[PDB]
Coordinates of C-alpha atoms in Angstrom, one line a residue:
Chain A
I1 CA 74.5 42.7 -97.5
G2 CA 75.8 42.8 -93.9
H3 CA 79.5 43.2 -93.1
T4 CA 79.3 39.8 -91.4
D5 CA 78.2 38.1 -94.6
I6 CA 81.1 39.4 -96.8
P7 CA 83.5 36.6 -97.5
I8 CA 87.2 36.8 -96.6
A9 CA 89.7 36.0 -99.3
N10 CA 93.1 34.3 -98.9
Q11 CA 95.2 35.1 -102.0
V12 CA 94.6 38.4 -103.9
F13 CA 96.4 39.2 -107.1
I14 CA 96.8 42.9 -107.7
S15 CA 98.2 44.3 -110.9
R16 CA 100.0 47.6 -110.2
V17 CA 98.4 50.3 -112.3
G18 CA 100.7 51.7 -114.9
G19 CA 101.7 55.2 -114.0
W20 CA 104.5 57.7 -114.2
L21 CA 104.9 57.4 -110.4
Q22 CA 105.0 53.6 -110.4
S23 CA 107.9 53.6 -112.8
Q24 CA 110.5 55.4 -110.7
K25 CA 113.0 52.8 -109.5
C26 CA 113.9 55.2 -106.7
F27 CA 110.3 55.0 -105.3
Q28 CA 109.0 51.5 -105.7
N29 CA 110.1 50.3 -102.2
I30 CA 108.3 53.1 -100.4
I31 CA 105.2 52.4 -102.5
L32 CA 105.0 48.7 -101.6
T33 CA 105.7 49.5 -98.0
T34 CA 102.8 52.0 -98.1
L35 CA 100.5 49.4 -99.5
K36 CA 101.6 46.9 -96.8
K37 CA 100.9 49.4 -94.1
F38 CA 97.6 50.6 -95.5
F39 CA 96.3 47.0 -95.6
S40 CA 97.8 46.4 -92.2
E41 CA 95.9 49.2 -90.6
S42 CA 92.5 47.3 -90.6
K43 CA 90.1 45.3 -92.6
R44 CA 89.2 46.5 -96.1
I45 CA 86.4 45.9 -98.6
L46 CA 87.0 45.4 -102.3
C47 CA 85.4 44.3 -105.5
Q48 CA 86.8 42.6 -108.6
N49 CA 88.1 44.9 -111.3
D50 CA 88.3 47.8 -108.8
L51 CA 91.0 50.3 -108.2
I52 CA 92.9 51.4 -105.0
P53 CA 94.5 54.9 -104.7
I54 CA 97.5 55.5 -102.4
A55 CA 98.7 59.0 -101.3
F56 CA 102.3 59.2 -100.0
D57 CA 104.9 61.7 -99.1
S58 CA 107.6 61.4 -101.8
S59 CA 110.0 63.4 -99.7
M60 CA 110.6 60.3 -97.6
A61 CA 112.0 58.5 -100.6
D62 CA 115.7 58.0 -99.6
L63 CA 114.7 58.3 -95.9
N64 CA 114.3 54.5 -95.6
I65 CA 113.4 54.5 -91.9
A66 CA 113.6 50.8 -90.8
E67 CA 110.6 48.5 -90.6
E68 CA 111.5 47.6 -87.0
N69 CA 109.3 50.6 -86.0
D70 CA 106.6 48.0 -85.7
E71 CA 103.1 49.5 -86.4
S72 CA 104.2 52.9 -85.5
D73 CA 101.9 54.0 -82.7
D74 CA 101.6 57.7 -83.6
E75 CA 101.1 57.2 -87.3
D76 CA 99.1 60.5 -87.0
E77 CA 102.0 62.5 -85.6
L78 CA 104.0 60.7 -88.3
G79 CA 101.5 61.7 -91.0
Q80 CA 101.8 65.3 -90.0
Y81 CA 105.6 64.6 -89.9
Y82 CA 104.8 63.4 -93.5
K83 CA 102.6 65.2 -96.0
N84 CA 101.1 62.9 -98.7
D85 CA 102.1 64.6 -102.0
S86 CA 102.0 62.0 -104.8
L87 CA 99.3 59.5 -105.7
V88 CA 99.3 56.0 -107.2
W89 CA 96.7 53.5 -108.3
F90 CA 96.4 49.7 -108.0
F91 CA 94.3 47.2 -109.9
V92 CA 92.7 44.2 -108.2
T93 CA 92.8 41.4 -110.7
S94 CA 91.8 38.4 -108.6
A95 CA 90.9 37.3 -105.1
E96 CA 91.1 33.7 -103.7
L97 CA 88.3 32.4 -101.5
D98 CA 86.5 29.1 -100.8
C99 CA 83.3 30.6 -99.4
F100 CA 81.2 31.1 -102.5
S101 CA 78.5 33.8 -102.3
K102 CA 76.1 35.5 -104.7
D103 CA 78.2 38.7 -104.4
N104 CA 81.6 37.2 -104.9
Chain B
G1 CA 102.2 40.2 -65.6
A2 CA 104.0 42.9 -67.6
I3 CA 103.4 46.5 -66.6
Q4 CA 100.2 47.8 -68.1
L5 CA 101.0 50.5 -70.6
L6 CA 99.4 53.9 -70.7
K7 CA 99.2 56.4 -73.6
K8 CA 102.1 56.2 -76.0
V9 CA 103.3 59.2 -78.1
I10 CA 106.1 60.5 -80.2
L11 CA 107.8 63.8 -79.5
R12 CA 110.3 66.3 -81.1
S13 CA 113.8 66.3 -79.6
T14 CA 114.9 69.7 -78.2
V15 CA 118.4 70.8 -77.3
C16 CA 116.9 73.7 -75.2
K17 CA 119.1 73.2 -72.1
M18 CA 117.0 73.1 -68.9
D19 CA 118.0 72.8 -65.3
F20 CA 117.8 69.0 -65.3
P21 CA 118.5 68.7 -61.5
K22 CA 121.6 66.7 -60.9
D23 CA 119.8 64.7 -58.1
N24 CA 118.4 62.3 -60.7
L25 CA 120.1 60.7 -63.7
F26 CA 117.4 59.6 -66.2
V27 CA 114.7 62.3 -66.4
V28 CA 113.2 64.5 -69.1
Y29 CA 111.0 67.5 -69.6
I30 CA 107.7 67.8 -71.4
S31 CA 105.2 70.6 -71.9
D32 CA 102.7 71.1 -69.2
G33 CA 100.0 72.0 -71.7
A34 CA 99.0 68.3 -71.8
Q35 CA 98.3 65.9 -69.0
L36 CA 101.0 63.5 -67.9
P37 CA 99.3 60.3 -66.6
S38 CA 102.6 58.9 -65.1
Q39 CA 106.1 60.2 -64.2
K40 CA 107.9 57.0 -65.3
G41 CA 108.1 55.7 -68.9
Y42 CA 110.4 54.6 -71.7
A43 CA 112.0 56.6 -74.5
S44 CA 113.3 55.3 -77.8
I45 CA 114.8 57.2 -80.7
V46 CA 113.5 56.2 -84.2
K47 CA 116.5 55.5 -86.4
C48 CA 116.3 57.1 -89.8
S49 CA 118.1 54.9 -92.2
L50 CA 119.7 57.1 -94.9
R51 CA 122.3 54.6 -96.1
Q52 CA 120.2 52.3 -98.3
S53 CA 122.4 52.9 -101.3
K54 CA 123.7 49.8 -103.1
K55 CA 120.4 48.3 -102.1
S56 CA 121.5 46.5 -98.9
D57 CA 120.6 48.0 -95.5
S58 CA 121.2 47.5 -91.8
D59 CA 117.8 46.1 -90.8
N60 CA 117.2 43.0 -88.6
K61 CA 119.0 40.9 -91.3
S62 CA 122.4 40.2 -89.9
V63 CA 122.1 43.3 -87.7
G64 CA 120.1 43.5 -84.5
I65 CA 118.4 46.5 -83.1
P66 CA 120.0 48.1 -80.0
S67 CA 117.9 48.7 -76.9
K68 CA 115.8 51.7 -78.0
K69 CA 113.4 51.3 -75.1
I70 CA 115.1 52.9 -72.1
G71 CA 113.4 53.8 -68.8
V72 CA 113.3 57.4 -67.8
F73 CA 111.3 59.6 -65.4
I74 CA 108.8 62.2 -66.6
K75 CA 107.9 65.7 -65.4
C76 CA 106.1 68.6 -67.0
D77 CA 107.4 72.1 -67.8
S78 CA 105.6 75.3 -68.8
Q79 CA 108.5 77.0 -70.7
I80 CA 109.3 74.1 -73.0
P81 CA 107.3 74.4 -76.3
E82 CA 104.2 72.3 -76.6
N83 CA 104.6 68.9 -78.2
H84 CA 108.3 68.8 -77.4
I85 CA 110.7 66.8 -75.3
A86 CA 114.0 67.6 -73.5
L87 CA 116.4 64.7 -72.5
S88 CA 119.0 64.6 -69.8
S89 CA 122.5 64.4 -71.2
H90 CA 122.9 60.9 -69.6
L91 CA 119.9 59.9 -71.8
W92 CA 121.7 61.3 -74.9
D93 CA 124.8 59.3 -74.1
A94 CA 122.7 56.2 -73.3
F95 CA 121.1 56.5 -76.8
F96 CA 124.6 56.9 -78.1
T97 CA 123.9 60.3 -79.6
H98 CA 124.9 63.9 -79.0
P99 CA 122.3 66.6 -78.1
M100 CA 120.3 67.4 -81.2
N101 CA 116.9 69.0 -81.9
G102 CA 114.2 67.6 -84.0
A103 CA 114.9 63.9 -83.4
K104 CA 111.7 62.0 -83.0
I105 CA 111.4 60.0 -79.8
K106 CA 108.9 57.2 -79.3
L107 CA 107.8 57.2 -75.7
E108 CA 105.3 55.5 -73.4
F109 CA 104.4 55.8 -69.7
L110 CA 103.6 53.2 -67.1
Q111 CA 101.6 53.0 -63.8
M112 CA 102.4 52.6 -60.1
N113 CA 101.0 49.1 -59.5
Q114 CA 103.5 46.3 -59.6
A115 CA 105.2 43.9 -57.2
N116 CA 107.8 42.5 -59.7
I117 CA 109.7 45.7 -58.9
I118 CA 112.5 44.8 -56.5
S119 CA 110.8 46.0 -53.2
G120 CA 114.1 46.3 -51.3
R121 CA 115.9 43.0 -50.9
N122 CA 118.9 42.3 -53.0
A123 CA 119.1 45.1 -55.6
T124 CA 122.4 43.7 -56.9
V125 CA 123.5 46.2 -59.6
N126 CA 126.0 44.6 -62.0
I127 CA 128.4 47.5 -62.6
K128 CA 130.4 45.6 -65.3
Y129 CA 133.1 48.3 -65.9
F130 CA 135.0 47.1 -69.0
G131 CA 137.4 50.1 -69.4
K132 CA 141.2 50.4 -68.8
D133 CA 143.4 52.0 -66.2
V134 CA 142.0 49.5 -63.6
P135 CA 140.3 52.5 -62.0
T136 CA 139.5 52.1 -58.3
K137 CA 135.9 53.3 -58.9
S138 CA 134.2 51.6 -56.0
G139 CA 130.7 50.2 -55.8
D140 CA 130.0 52.7 -53.1
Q141 CA 131.5 55.5 -55.3
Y142 CA 129.3 54.5 -58.2
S143 CA 126.3 54.4 -55.9
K144 CA 127.0 57.9 -54.8
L145 CA 127.3 58.7 -58.5
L146 CA 124.4 56.5 -59.5
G147 CA 121.7 57.1 -56.9
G148 CA 118.2 58.2 -58.0
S149 CA 118.3 55.9 -61.0
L150 CA 115.7 53.7 -62.7
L151 CA 117.9 50.9 -64.0
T152 CA 117.1 48.3 -66.6
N153 CA 118.8 45.2 -67.9
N154 CA 121.5 45.6 -70.6
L155 CA 122.0 49.3 -70.7
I156 CA 125.3 51.2 -71.2
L157 CA 126.6 54.6 -70.3
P158 CA 129.7 55.2 -72.6
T159 CA 130.6 58.4 -70.7
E160 CA 131.7 56.1 -67.8
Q161 CA 132.0 53.2 -70.3
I162 CA 129.9 51.2 -67.9
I163 CA 127.5 48.4 -68.9
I164 CA 124.8 47.3 -66.4
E165 CA 122.5 44.3 -66.4
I166 CA 120.6 44.8 -63.1
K167 CA 120.4 41.4 -61.3
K168 CA 118.6 40.2 -58.2
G169 CA 120.7 37.1 -57.4
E170 CA 120.0 35.0 -60.4
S171 CA 116.6 36.8 -61.1
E172 CA 117.0 39.8 -63.5
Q173 CA 115.0 43.0 -63.4
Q174 CA 114.1 45.9 -65.7
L175 CA 112.9 48.6 -63.2
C176 CA 113.8 50.1 -59.8
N177 CA 113.5 53.4 -57.9
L178 CA 115.7 55.0 -55.3
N179 CA 112.7 56.4 -53.5
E180 CA 110.9 53.1 -53.1
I181 CA 114.0 51.1 -52.1
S182 CA 116.3 51.3 -49.1
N183 CA 119.9 52.3 -50.1
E184 CA 121.2 49.4 -48.0
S185 CA 119.4 46.8 -50.1
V186 CA 121.3 47.7 -53.3
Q187 CA 124.6 45.8 -53.9
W188 CA 127.4 47.2 -56.1
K189 CA 129.9 45.0 -57.8
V190 CA 133.1 46.3 -59.4
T191 CA 135.0 44.0 -61.9
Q192 CA 136.2 43.9 -65.5
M193 CA 134.6 41.5 -67.9
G194 CA 136.5 39.4 -70.4
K195 CA 137.8 41.7 -73.2
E196 CA 136.5 39.2 -75.8
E197 CA 132.9 39.6 -74.8
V198 CA 133.4 43.3 -74.4
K199 CA 134.7 43.5 -78.0
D200 CA 131.8 41.5 -79.2
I201 CA 129.3 43.7 -77.3
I202 CA 130.8 46.9 -78.8
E203 CA 130.9 45.4 -82.3
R204 CA 127.2 44.3 -82.0
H205 CA 125.8 47.5 -80.3
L206 CA 128.3 50.4 -80.4
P207 CA 128.6 51.7 -84.0
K208 CA 132.1 52.2 -85.2
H209 CA 131.4 55.9 -85.9
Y210 CA 130.0 56.9 -82.4
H211 CA 132.4 58.2 -79.8
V212 CA 130.6 60.0 -77.0
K213 CA 133.8 61.5 -75.7
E214 CA 133.2 65.2 -75.9
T215 CA 136.9 66.0 -75.5
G216 CA 137.8 63.2 -77.9
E217 CA 136.2 65.4 -80.7
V218 CA 137.7 68.8 -80.0
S219 CA 135.0 71.4 -80.4
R220 CA 136.2 74.0 -78.0
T221 CA 139.0 74.9 -80.3
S222 CA 139.2 78.5 -79.2
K223 CA 135.5 79.2 -79.9
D224 CA 135.1 82.0 -77.3
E225 CA 131.6 83.5 -77.2
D226 CA 132.7 86.5 -79.2
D227 CA 130.1 89.2 -79.4
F228 CA 130.2 91.7 -82.3
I229 CA 127.7 94.0 -80.7
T230 CA 127.0 96.6 -83.4
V231 CA 126.6 93.9 -86.1
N232 CA 124.0 92.3 -83.8
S233 CA 121.7 95.0 -85.1
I234 CA 121.4 92.6 -88.0
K235 CA 121.6 89.3 -86.1
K236 CA 118.7 90.1 -83.9
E237 CA 116.6 90.8 -87.0
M238 CA 117.7 87.7 -88.9
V239 CA 116.8 85.2 -86.2
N240 CA 113.4 86.9 -86.0
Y241 CA 112.9 86.7 -89.7
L242 CA 114.2 83.2 -89.7
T243 CA 112.1 82.4 -86.6
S244 CA 109.1 84.2 -88.2
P245 CA 106.3 81.6 -88.7
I246 CA 106.0 82.5 -92.4
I247 CA 108.8 83.2 -94.9
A248 CA 108.0 84.7 -98.3
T249 CA 110.7 82.7 -100.0
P250 CA 112.7 79.9 -98.3
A251 CA 116.0 81.8 -98.8
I252 CA 117.8 84.7 -97.3
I253 CA 121.3 85.8 -98.4
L254 CA 123.9 87.4 -96.0
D255 CA 126.4 89.4 -98.0
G256 CA 129.7 90.9 -97.1
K257 CA 133.0 92.2 -98.5
Chain C
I1 CA 102.8 78.1 -130.0
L2 CA 103.9 81.1 -127.9
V3 CA 102.5 81.7 -124.4
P4 CA 102.4 85.5 -123.8
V5 CA 102.9 87.4 -120.7
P6 CA 99.4 87.5 -119.0
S7 CA 97.1 90.3 -120.1
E8 CA 94.7 92.3 -117.9
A9 CA 91.9 89.7 -117.7
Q10 CA 94.6 86.9 -117.3
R11 CA 96.0 88.7 -114.3
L12 CA 92.5 89.1 -113.0
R13 CA 91.9 85.4 -113.1
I14 CA 95.4 84.7 -111.6
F15 CA 94.3 86.8 -108.6
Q16 CA 90.9 85.1 -108.5
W17 CA 92.8 81.8 -108.2
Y18 CA 95.5 82.7 -105.7
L19 CA 93.4 84.8 -103.4
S20 CA 90.8 82.0 -103.2
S21 CA 90.9 80.9 -99.5
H22 CA 91.9 77.3 -99.9
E23 CA 94.9 78.2 -101.9
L24 CA 96.1 80.4 -99.0
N25 CA 95.3 77.8 -96.4
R26 CA 97.5 75.2 -98.1
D27 CA 100.5 75.4 -95.7
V28 CA 98.9 77.1 -92.7
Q29 CA 99.7 74.8 -89.9
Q30 CA 98.8 77.4 -87.3
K31 CA 95.2 77.1 -86.2
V32 CA 94.2 80.6 -87.1
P33 CA 92.7 80.7 -90.6
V34 CA 93.7 83.1 -93.4
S35 CA 91.5 85.3 -95.5
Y36 CA 91.1 88.8 -96.9
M37 CA 88.8 91.8 -96.5
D38 CA 86.1 92.0 -99.2
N39 CA 86.8 95.7 -100.1
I40 CA 89.7 94.8 -102.4
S41 CA 89.5 96.5 -105.8
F42 CA 90.8 93.6 -107.9
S43 CA 90.7 95.6 -111.2
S44 CA 93.0 98.2 -109.7
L45 CA 95.5 95.4 -108.7
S46 CA 95.3 94.0 -112.2
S47 CA 95.9 97.4 -113.8
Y48 CA 98.9 98.0 -111.5
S49 CA 100.1 94.5 -112.3
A50 CA 101.6 95.7 -115.6
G51 CA 104.6 93.8 -117.0
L52 CA 104.6 90.8 -114.6
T53 CA 104.4 87.0 -114.6
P54 CA 102.2 84.6 -112.6
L55 CA 105.2 83.5 -110.5
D56 CA 105.7 87.2 -109.6
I57 CA 102.0 87.3 -108.6
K58 CA 102.6 84.3 -106.3
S59 CA 105.6 86.2 -104.8
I60 CA 103.6 89.4 -104.2
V61 CA 100.6 87.6 -102.7
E62 CA 102.8 85.7 -100.4
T63 CA 104.6 88.9 -99.4
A64 CA 101.2 90.5 -98.7
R65 CA 100.4 87.4 -96.5
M66 CA 103.6 88.2 -94.8
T67 CA 103.0 91.8 -93.9
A68 CA 99.5 90.8 -92.8
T69 CA 100.8 88.0 -90.5
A70 CA 103.5 90.2 -89.0
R71 CA 101.1 93.0 -88.3
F72 CA 98.5 90.6 -86.9
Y73 CA 101.0 89.0 -84.5
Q74 CA 102.3 92.4 -83.5
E75 CA 98.8 93.6 -82.7
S76 CA 98.1 90.5 -80.7
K77 CA 101.2 91.2 -78.6
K78 CA 100.3 94.9 -78.4
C79 CA 96.7 95.0 -77.3
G80 CA 96.1 91.4 -76.1
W81 CA 92.7 91.3 -77.8
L82 CA 93.3 88.7 -80.5
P83 CA 91.0 88.8 -83.6
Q84 CA 89.7 85.6 -85.0
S85 CA 91.5 85.5 -88.4
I86 CA 94.1 87.2 -90.6
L87 CA 93.3 90.1 -93.0
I88 CA 95.2 91.7 -95.9
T89 CA 94.8 95.3 -96.8
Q90 CA 95.0 97.3 -100.1
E91 CA 97.9 99.1 -98.6
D92 CA 99.7 95.8 -98.0
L93 CA 99.3 94.7 -101.6
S94 CA 100.3 98.2 -102.8
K95 CA 103.5 98.0 -100.8
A96 CA 104.1 94.4 -102.1
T97 CA 103.6 95.8 -105.6
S98 CA 106.2 98.5 -104.9
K99 CA 108.6 95.9 -103.6
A100 CA 108.0 93.7 -106.6
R101 CA 108.6 96.5 -109.1
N102 CA 111.7 97.4 -107.1
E103 CA 113.3 93.9 -107.1
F104 CA 112.3 93.4 -110.7

């Protein structure tokens, strides 16, 4: 398979993986924001039934720095401003595409 | 047509007070350890929203974002710590904040190739003073007080309580330099805008908690720089221990009768 | 089930864990790495570690890291010939043991 030939999906259903981290009401928003960013960074490759781990700095929990910091340029100086401490997992349950291939 | 943008970086705010020559108004200091492609750029604080309790927040929903991007000159320094930034007091007032270390400033330079810049003719600065006392501050007086400035549309200095939207006739502008312009070709207007729009502007941009007035919040309440010299035999140590790169445990206790 | 105070071999293993490089290089943002001379008689430290708990072992190892870092920076200021890493001496750990027994 070449990276060109990999089909692009449109709708992807992801079931959040049950975990002690995923439960905390005080955290959920930072988690979903982390996912949105991580996918916003660049293209990604995925398979059905797979799992996706995310590492995040829980210390930023109540520090809800606004989203208007669009695609923060120095995400690296920010990451060192952060320090990913806690991990979460995510389950890919479906992906929507209309370009059928052998390796769906 | 916009000005091509050079490297963009964030930096740690520092209250280490430098010379900050009074000649200029909006200038900063950066460590010389790194290369500075340009001397002109923009700075922008990154608001840290701590008040998201009761769910609701102060994001773009029903609340706009003030002008974070503000033009400022750039120049290196060898003493300032690496990966650090010092801002002119006028910059702190413009950002509507007091001096404070550790604040993270987004910043990005520019380059010196542009004709949109007002090359002389008709640098009509809109000094829209909206204060009280009908002060006789003249356009010439403000010029004397405002020379060496890189102006930009819709920026405010609460110390003088002056809002400026630099205009060229009916054509606006975001940049200008004293050096590249003739002082004759800059026009100063002194007036007072309708108090209704001033109230709306402050309600939309000036937060109800911020009051730049240093004397308004009395801090020099008989705080003379008292030196207890003998007891400094401890102070000198403590700072070192506190400033030591490594601390065995995060805490130190100072005890006294 | 009761968890006892660590015994000799237990303290030995505690030291094997903490003094392992990566554990010391956790929160070392400064470029210079951290490590210890190989002439350390671990058994002697374990024997001298009578009546302590693993948290106290963390305290003492960090205090040794301290005396080492202070001495190293002082030497760099003094002579101007900077070595290429940090070192911790048997004397430093002995004095850390003395300090630990004291505060205990």
